[PDB]
Amino acid sequence: KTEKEKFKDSINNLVKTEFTNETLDKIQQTQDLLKKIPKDVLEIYSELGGEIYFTDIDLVEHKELQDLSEEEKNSMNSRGEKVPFASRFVFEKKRETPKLIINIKDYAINSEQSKEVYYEIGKGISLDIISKDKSLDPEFLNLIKSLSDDSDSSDLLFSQKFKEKLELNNKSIDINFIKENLTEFQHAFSLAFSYYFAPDHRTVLELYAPDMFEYMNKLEKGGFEKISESLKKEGV
Amino acid sequence: TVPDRDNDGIPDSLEVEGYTVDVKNKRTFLSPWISNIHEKKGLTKYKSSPEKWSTASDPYSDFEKVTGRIDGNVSPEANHPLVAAYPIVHVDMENIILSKNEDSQTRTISKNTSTSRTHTSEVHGNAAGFSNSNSSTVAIDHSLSLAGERTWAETMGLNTADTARLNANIRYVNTGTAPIYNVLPTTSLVLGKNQTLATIKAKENQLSQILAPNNYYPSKNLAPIALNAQDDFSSTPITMNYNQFLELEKTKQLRLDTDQVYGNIATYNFENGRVRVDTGSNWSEVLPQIQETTARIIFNGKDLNLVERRIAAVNPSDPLETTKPDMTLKEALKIAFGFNEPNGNLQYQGKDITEFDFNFDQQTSQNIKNQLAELNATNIYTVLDKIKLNAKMNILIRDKRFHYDRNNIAVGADESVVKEAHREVINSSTEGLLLNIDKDIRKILSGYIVEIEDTEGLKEVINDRYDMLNISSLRQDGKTFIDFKKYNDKLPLYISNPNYKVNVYAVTKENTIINPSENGDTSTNGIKKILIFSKKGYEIG
Amino acid sequence: TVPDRDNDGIPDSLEVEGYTVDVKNKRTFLSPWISNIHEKKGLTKYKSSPEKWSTASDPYSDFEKVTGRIDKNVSPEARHPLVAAYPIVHVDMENIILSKNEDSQTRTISKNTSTSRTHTSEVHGNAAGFSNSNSSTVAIDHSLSLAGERTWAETMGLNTADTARLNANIRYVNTGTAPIYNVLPTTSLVLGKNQTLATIKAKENQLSQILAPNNYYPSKNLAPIALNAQDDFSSTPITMNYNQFLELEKTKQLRLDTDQVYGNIATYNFENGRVRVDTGSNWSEVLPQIQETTARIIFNGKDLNLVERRIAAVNPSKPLETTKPDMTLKEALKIAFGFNEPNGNLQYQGKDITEFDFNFDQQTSQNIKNQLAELNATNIYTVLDKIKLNAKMNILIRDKRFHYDRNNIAVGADESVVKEAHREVINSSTEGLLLNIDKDIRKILSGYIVEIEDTEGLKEVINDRYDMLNISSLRQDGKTFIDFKKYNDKLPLYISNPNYKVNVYAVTKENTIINPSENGDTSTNGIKKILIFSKKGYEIG
Amino acid sequence: NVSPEANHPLVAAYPIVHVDMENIILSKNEDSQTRTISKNTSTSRTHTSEVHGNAAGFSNSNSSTVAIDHSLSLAGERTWAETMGLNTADTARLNANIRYVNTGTAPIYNVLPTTSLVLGKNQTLATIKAKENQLSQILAPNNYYPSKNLAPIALNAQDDFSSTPITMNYNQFLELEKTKQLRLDTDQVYGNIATYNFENGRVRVDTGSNWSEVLPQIQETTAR
Ligand SMILES: [Ca+2]
Ligand SMILES: [Ca+2]
Ligand SMILES: [Ca+2]
Ligand SMILES: [Ca+2]
């Protein structure tokens, strides 16, 4: 490794020698975004019946398939509670079948925008990993039990209202509390999904909540494939 | 692997979108800004530039600054990636002695001085102001110490064909944010305008001692450095002929131009953590790069002394200096000096931001007037969180209450606050006065004038001399002491009638005189004074 | 596997066809020029040579120049790949002081000077034209400061057997586009034509200070450097005999030739971003190659001072210099000095290009006359975007209004300009006047002549001497002050009648006289004057 | 700085520098304001051939002859020996202004050559040995070393480290007034060669290369 080679790969990504088009590079960056979640997650989303679309620049519903139709009726879909639909770039249409609309942006350069995509993907496939038939698949119930009050630094996975309600009820194992706040359970799973698969900060989940990391690691090392082939064999 | 272009240790996306260094179980951890769990513990959200190894161009990294793997003498506000760490050392002169060049026990004159760091601006209208140099002016005491000493030239006994020698005690002082380790700078002593008397060149590496920030080199519990006193390898005195002595007695003022040659830089060594002076690094390599890519701000809120800090701002013509984060004026004040907003109002220890005065050079005033034009506002104190800073700006925040001379030193206030400052009496007597005057107000008072008034009203000034105003003394408990006995032959105030009135006057540093007037005027006739004290003779006892 | 012959970092096709440097979110990208998406954002289209490591042959690369990874004191106009970055330092002389070689207190002459960088051109008819070295000619003041000083030789008391010594205060100034870091050049003081009095040689490594562009080495708020006043080891003064003193008193002008030895070059270091003085590089290896492959343009539109830039043009003999991009004259003016086209017309801050006077030397005149003939045009201002530049071209743009001497200094304009420039009268009084004269016009005025016109009309000149025209002053706010009090025994103007006219004249520097004339003329008879100020006596007060 | 016709592979590139003398002043060895004589000169490079028939012509050396002006400048100045006021037991001193000039095709960079001043046939008056590396300046082809807008080099004038004058006794003064001609034999010691460096293109003076190694090989394989 001479000085010339060290300088030559010091500027390996600063010189874009083949650019030639503006919206042809956003497409390559969106493809490189989506190609690093594993194959089993995408195949679970297809066996559920899901769609993913790389639309052009039309933020509010100029998109003809997310057009003036069935839509969100809420106050919170980000990691906070904004939903200012003029300034969104990912939405999921899941009424009769799942369908994900991903606007194309510069995802290799922005890493905060590149996390809402994984958050909505994990929101989409939440109810088929968090449950088996109509339940909470009680490994996940033991997980939320182990993260409820046993760690003050596992409030990165819960909302504010879910935290105060789980504080007030304080013994939530019953099926009364489970079906009253299932959206918060999906929120916790999807937020751990986005923290696990964003490349820059996975170790924040490994540090501040070390047992959710084990759940996600076993998922990635074969639970996704298991639930995929289960839904496949049920599909025939 | 993660991309890291500048090669300091922090990945790019963290440096662009925010990061902080948290301490888990006991180990440290460099994490992105999770707003839920990092805001509770009171951590700071950092931002840097992903293509500079040191965003403020100072010789410490971004990683080293945020994680604490730095020299521990580096000032605490220079632990931020956006505040530069560099030394600003000048020379403090304590007292001088003057004698003729050769029985010389009464043929000398010994006076105390007063040294302050200067920021020489432009002349008003009848002659870009702010430039990079360390200089300070001294102020030899014009008043008397003995009973009847007078007439400096005749006190020393000089004629036209005589030369005088100079000797003084100096002390270096580092008011920057980084320490010097072996080398001391080479100051020169300038009289008048360009008449350089001597160059002080205290020999390097006869010391090995540290000049930390906010500290003196011969520390305050040691003895000062004497100018040309010991003669070990200094066979030359500091000579001064009669003409220069005449200008020195006319002005009673000198100047000490200190240059910027410092030593080496002490850097953290990653194998055993030993901070060791590196012979490769040098401050001469670093200081121009700091001076070209940052925006200085000068402030005198803590006391009436100027403090210079430099904050790393963008520069729109440069592609590498468009990488640094956006710096507003409010954030620069909050991270460099120590301002905070308790309720929503930016204030520096109680004093609100509207009590301070903004001054720029020409370029900055143009640059900021254009921002106020396109922001559609007229008050800079309202939009203080939207004024973007760029590189090579120069701002000067100073206090509104006072009046400043050419060197931006506080030399006087208006009358109303001087009268308000003296409305706390602890004890009153015919021997003196006990008051709680504030420490900043009492820095602009040259001395006092005491007089006695008849019951019908008369004007009898006790100490009717220009060199007899130093009747104030300060005790360490924090309470001043005026004294009538100092120029009344050690005898108290002679009250003739208990229904008399006592009148004490105050003269600020812009109004006092240092030399008698053209004919013989050692009188306090044409001196602008201020009513401070008016009680009766039956109330002081 | 892209081709890169020169190893600067940019691939060949980018360097030939156009490239630009753009900052995204916070990172910098070097991408080719795509016209529709790049012109909107306001970016610059760069073009370079694919076979030189630096197209302008200076020590900074093409990559380092356009991407900002350069020593930050390199001037912003020299960050283009086609503008050379090299220092041009000359010596500025503040004041001289002349004493006789050994009661000598009123036997010295202390005068103010005026130093300007010169560009000596071709002589007219009775003696490559433009030569490349730094030289400046001082001009000693011929007026009087003492009320009754006359006759320099008898002012000092100089005889034919005596010798006279010289002392002066100088300071250096870098007007180029790169800094000098440790070494200062060795200037030499030539008097007359070839009579070198002394060689001013600064001590080696007596400084570690940077000499940045547009900056002085002893800065404007410090003390200047004095020639041989230090004495000690260098007690060798600068001695003139009687004939040389008579030549100096006749001519009142010296010359300071400065050579081109500078220090080393400070280079960016890609690992930790540190700018450090490289002992491997040197300016003397670079300056010939800059001087042989570039085209020089000299321009004085900002102020009446000559400013030299060099632009990398082709040389059709060498195949390595046929690789550089094509450089028209218009683009050279736009990227080197700061001209622009707001509405189609090439102008320099309001002043159109047609107010400037193109002057080439011999070879360039032939080279450009051929292009004008083959373009079938006669007005050069029309085809300014088709005149191709080549290597070793010397062009000299200057302002059309004034008249220039042999060293291309403006020494006095047409009279109609001087009359127009004095049409703003602010204050009229018996003691003086206040006018808003322009900064450019006030460079060429040597002094003023005051006389009184009667109601009939007479002539009585108050300052009727060649060395008494110095009356004018300037307040710093922007208002000059003419003064009749200076040569009227400190008594005001004797308005004998309110129906009189007070005639004031102006004399330019090409019409003034600095010596007594042939027989005895210490009078202003043979001095060409311009009518400036003639109003009634009752509009004055 | 290599001359444009030496860009051909078949034309050699090498420096040919000689000394140009501008004006001389002559005075007696010690009131000397009219006891001097100042004359302008004229220097030309020579190519000394064979004598006609009554005494291979062309050889490798740099030499030039000067021609002191024989005419007058004042109204009635005459008789050089009596103008200076010399007798048989007097010695005179010499001082002049010189300028080097490179008429070859390559530049010299630091070192200047060491010429000698020859009067008559072999009477060497002095050797001019202007101190190397007190300069760092270039002597390009077709250019003078103290350039024409600067001041010339004065022979033995400043005396900084030169305590010896250029003395001349009465007999040599007689031959000088008889001939009004000198000679300046300049040798061929030059500096180093500045070579192109292929990584960054910097032309830099190489301490390995030297003109003394190259010049005999040029002189043996070429045709002048
Ligand atoms: Ca980094
Ligand atoms: Ca960084
Ligand atoms: Ca290239
Ligand atoms: Ca190139």
Distances (CA, A) of D39 to A112, A222, D3, D73, D181: 87, 106, 35, 9, 12
Tell me the three state secondary structure of residue C216: strand
Which residue of D133, D200, D206, D207 to mutate against C (max C Cβ within 10 Å)?
Answer: D200
Residue A106's CATH number: 3.40.390.10
Chain B touched by A236 (CB under 8 Å): no
Residue (of B105, B95, B104) closest to B227 by Cα position: B95
**What distance, in Å, lies between the first and last C-alpha atoms of chain A?**
57
CA separation for the pair C153, C157 (Å, rounded): 6
SS (H, E, C) C148-170: CCCCHHHHHCCCCCCCEEEEEEE
What is the amino acid identity at position B152? W
The span from the CA of B451 to the CA of B449, in Å, is 7
Euclidean distance between CA atoms C392 and C404, whole angstroms: 24
Domain that holds residue A209: 22-233
DSSP label of D130: P
Query: Is A6 part of a structural domain of the chain?
Result: no
Residue of C nearest to A21 (CA): C34
Which A residues in the span 79-118 are in contact with C, Cβ-Cβ below 8 Å?
A: 106, 109-110
Strand partners, C351: C348
Token reading at A100: 């994900």
Taking the centre of ligand 3 as the mean of its atom positions, its distance from the CA of residue C300, in whole angstroms, is: 35
Q: Are B85 and B309 in contact (CB under 8 A)?
A: no
SS3 C500: coil
DSSP percent split of chain A into helix, strand, coil, nearest 5: 50, 5, 45
Q: Provide Rg for chain C, Cα atoms.
A: 28
Q: Is residue A61 part of a domain?
A: yes
Do residues B213 and B73 touch, judged by C-beta distance below 8 A?
yes
Is A41 inside any structural domain? Answer: yes
Of B45, B56, B76, B75, the residue nearest B8 (C-alpha): B56
- Residue in D148, D151, D199 closest to C7 by CB: D199
> Smallest Cβ distance to C24: which of A19, A21, A109?
A109
Query: Is B131 part of the contact surface with chain C (CB cutoff 8 Å)?
Result: yes
**Cβ separation A200–B5 shorter than 8 A:** no
Of B355, B365, B372, nearest to B395 (Cα)? Answer: B365
Q: Give CA separation, B17 vs B20, B37, B45, C286, in Å.
A: 11, 17, 10, 43
How far apart are the C-alpha atoms of C483 and C534, rounded to whole Å? 16
With beta carbons less than 8 A apart as the criterion, state whether B66 and B46 touch.
yes
User: In this complex, do B135 and C477 lie within 8 Å of one another by their Cβ atoms?
Assistant: no
What is the Cβ-side half-sphere exposure of residue A174, based on CA atoms within 13 angstroms?
7
The amino acid at C491: L
Tell me if B6 sits within 8 A of C273, measured CB to CB: yes
**Which ligand places an atom closest to the C-alpha of A11?**
3
| Residues B383, B358: Cα–Cα separation, whole Å | 14
Instruction: Check CB contact under 8 Å for B37 and A156.
Output: yes
Which backbone phi and psi does A100 adopt, to 5 degrees? -110, 130
Distance CA C76, CA C57 (A): 17
Q: Tell me whether C67 touches chain B (CB under 8 Å).
A: yes
Binding residues of C: 4, 6, 8, 10, 15, 49, 52, 62
CB contact under 8 A, B131 and C219: yes
- Written as one string, the DSSP assignment of C243-301 is HHHHHHHHH--EEEEE------EEE--TTTT--EEESS--GGGTHHHHHHSSEEEEE-S
Q: How far is CA C80 from CA B410, C267, C348, in A?
A: 47, 17, 19
Does B contact D via 3+ CB–CB distances below 8 Å? no
CB contact under 8 A, A11 and C9: yes
Instruction: Tell me the CA–centroid distance for residue C340 and ligand 4, in Å.
Output: 27
Spell out the alpha helix ranges (H) of A71-158: 113-124, 139-146
Question: How far is CA C354 from each of CA B233, C345, C397, rounded to the nearest angstrom?
Answer: 67, 10, 11
Residue A173 lies in a domain: yes
Is A11 within a domain?
Answer: no
D contact test, residue of C52, C239, C289, C321 with most D CBs within 10 A: C289
C-alpha angle with apex B509: B507 to B511, nearest 5 degrees?
Answer: 60
Give long-range contacts, CB 8 A cutoff, 24+ apart: C381-384.
Answer: C381/C353, C381/C354, C384/C328, C384/C329, C384/C330, C384/C346, C384/C353
Please provide the DSSP assignment of C303-334 as one string.
SSS-EEEEE--B-TTSSGGGSSPP-BHHHHHH
CB atoms within 10 A of CB C7: 15
Across the interface, do C34 and A20 touch by the CB < 8 Å criterion? Answer: yes
DSSP string, B183-240: -----EEEETTTEEEEE--PPTTS----B-TTEESS-TTSPPEETT-S-SS-----EE
Vertex A108, ends A104 and A111: CA angle to 5°?
95
CB C497 within 8 A of CB C528: no
Two tokens, residue D97: 């202004």
CA distance A208 to chain C (A): 29
Distance CA C298, CA C311 (A): 11
Q: Under a CB-based contact definition with an 8 Å cutoff, are residues C175 and C214 in contact?
A: yes
Biggest alpha carbon–alpha carbon distance for chain A: 68
CA-wise closest residue to D150 among C88, C405, C257: C257
The verdict on residue A5 lying in a domain is no
Could you tell me if C527 lies within 8 Å of chain B, comparing CB atoms?
Answer: no
Which residues in chain D are closer than 8 Å to C286, comparing Cβ atoms?
A: 202
- From residue B535, give the alpha-carbon distance in Å to each of B134, B416, B432, B541: 47, 19, 13, 11
How many C-beta atoms surround the C-beta of residue D123 within 10 A?
A: 13
8 Å CB contact of C28 and A10: no
Q: Which residue of A has its CA nearest to B28?
A: A207
Distance CA A225, CA A235 (A): 15
Between CA C469 and CA C472 the distance in angstroms is 8
Identify the three-state secondary structure at position C42.
coil
* N-terminal to C-terminal alpha carbon distance within chain D: 22
Element (H, E) at B97: strand B89-100
10 Å Cβ neighbour count for B91?
Answer: 25
**Those residues with Cβ within 8 angstroms of residue B23's Cβ, 6 or more apart along the chain or in another chain:** B29
Can you tell me the distance from the alpha carbon of C522 to that of B164, in angstroms, rounded to the nearest whole number? 45
User: Helix or strand or coil: residue C104?
Assistant: coil
Distances (CA, A) of B507 to B435, B467, B469, B532, C332: 17, 12, 9, 10, 63
Residue in B closest to C79 by C-alpha: B318
- Exposure on the CB side of residue A52, measured as CA atoms within 13 A: 17
Cα separation, C500 vs D4, whole angstroms: 73
Distance from the Cα of A234 to chain B's closest Cα (Å) equals: 39
Measured distance CA(B257)–CA(B190) in Å, rounded: 7
- CA-based nearest distance A231→chain B, Å: 35
C contact test, residue of D99, D136, D159 with most C CBs within 10 A: D136
Among candidates A199, A200, A204 on the partner chain, residue whose Cβ is nearest the Cβ of B34: A204
Pick from C259, C286, C292: which is nearest to D137 by CB? C259
**Per the domain annotation, does A7 fall within a domain?**
no
**CB spacing of A200 vs B3 below 8 angstroms:** no
Burial of residue B59, with CB atoms counted within 10 A of its CB: 0-12 exposed, 13-18 middle, 19 or more buried:
buried
As a dihedral over the C-alpha atoms of residue B59, residue B65, residue B71, residue B77, rounded to 10 degrees, the angle is 100
- Rounded to the nearest whole angstrom, what is the distance from the C-alpha of residue D138 to the centroid of ligand 4? 27
Residue B382 and residue B421 in contact, taking contact as beta carbons nearer than 8 Å? no
The CA-atom distances, in angstroms, between C24 and each of A27, B279, D92 are 17, 38, 81
* Edge-to-edge strands, sheet with C501-508: C445-453, C501-508, C530-533
* CA-based nearest residue to B354, from B379, B334, B387, B376: B379
Which one, of B48, B79, B119, B142, lies nearest residue B514 by Cα?
A: B142
Query: By C-alpha distance, which of C387, C154, C114 is closest to C253?
Result: C114
Q: Whose CA is closest to C402, among C415, C390, C392? A: C415
Secondary structure (3-state) at D93: strand
- On whether the CB atoms of residues B397 and B119 are closer than 8 A, the answer is no
Q: Which chains lie within 8 Å of chain C at 3 or more CB pairs, if any? A: A, B, D
Helix axes A182-197, A113-124, angle to 10 degrees: 130
The widest CA-to-CA distance across chain C, in whole angstroms, is 93
Contact (CB<8Å) B17/A14: no
Q: Is C291 left (phi over 0), alpha (psi -120 to 50) or beta?
A: alpha
Per DSSP, the residues of A10-58 read TTTTTB-S----SHHHHHHHHHHHHTTS-HHHHHHHHHHT--EEEE-S-
- Determine contact, residues B480/B425, Cβ cutoff 8 Å: no
Calpha distance B333→B328 (Å, rounded): 9
The three-state secondary structure class of D173 is helix
Residues with CB under 5 A from ligand 3 (ion): C 4, 6, 8, 10
What's the length of chain B?
541
Residue C267 φ then ψ, to 5°: -120, 145
Decide: A100 and A90 in contact? Cβ < 8 Å. Answer: yes
CB C313 within 8 A of CB C389: yes
State the total domains in chain A.
1
Q: What is the CA radius of gyration of chain B?
A: 28
Q: Is residue A13 part of a domain?
A: no
Taking alpha carbons only, the member of C198, C212, C210, C182 closest to residue C257 is C198
Q: Please spell the DSSP secondary structure of B308-348, one letter per residue.
A: EEEEE-B-TT-SSTTSSPP-BHHHHHHHHT--B-SSS--EE
Q: Helix or strand or coil: residue C26?
A: coil
Angstrom distance (rounded) from CA C15 to CA C65: 13
CA-to-CA distance for B54 and B63, rounded, in angstroms?
9
What does the alpha-carbon distance between residue B141 and residue B157 come to, in Å, rounded to a whole number?
A: 20
- Closest residue by Cα to residue C530 from C402, C400, C418: C418
Q: Which residue of B has its CA nearest to C272?
A: B53
Please state, in angstroms and as integers, the Cα–Cα distance from residue D145 to each residue in C102, C247, C409, D127, D142, following that order.
38, 27, 27, 18, 10
Residues of each annotated binding site of C for Ca(2+): 4, 6, 8, 10, 15, 49, 52, 62
Residues in chain C: 541
The region, left, alpha or beta by phi > 0 then psi within -120 to 50, assigned to residue C390 is: beta
Q: Do D201 and C54 touch (CB under 8 A)?
A: yes
Q: Which residues of C touch B129 (CB under 8 A)?
A: none
Beta carbons within 10 angstroms of residue B335's beta carbon: 18
Return the closest-CA partner of residue B256 out of B93, B463, B405: B93
Give the CA-trace dihedral at A102, A103, A108, A111, to 10 degrees.
-80
Q: Which residues, 6+ apart, have CB-to-CB distance to C35 below 8 Å?
A: none
The label of the residue with tokens 């009496």 reads B425
Task: Map residue C445 onto helix, strand or coil.
Answer: strand
Residue type, B477: D
Q: For residue A214, what are the contacts with CB-CB under 8 A and spacing of at least 6?
A: none
- Cα separation, C540 vs C471, in Å, equals 19
Chain A adjacent subunits, 3+ CB pairs under 8 A: B, C
CA C26 from centroid of its chain's CA atoms: 41
The tokens 């143009």 sit on which residue? B366
CB atoms within 10 A of CB B62: 26
The residue among C131, C270, D213 whose CA lies nearest residue B53 is C270
CA of B324 to the centre of ligand 3 (A): 28
- The reply to whether A24 touches chain C by the CB within 8 Å rule is no
Are D35 and D28 spatial neighbours (Cβ–Cβ below 8 Å)? yes
Burial B291-300 (b: 16+ CB within 10 A, else e): bbbbbbbbbb
Angle, alpha carbons D5-D8-D11 (nearest 5°): 75
Judge residue C458's burial from the number of C-beta atoms within 10 Å of its C-beta, 0-12 exposed, 13-18 middle, 19 or more buried: exposed
**Inter-residue contact D111 to D100 (CB < 8 Å):** no
CA distance B141 to B56: 42
C-alpha to C-alpha distance for B332 and B501, rounded to whole angstroms: 53
CA-based nearest residue to B339, from B328, B352, B327: B352
Going by their DSSP bridges, the two strands D91-102 and D36-40 should be labelled as unpaired
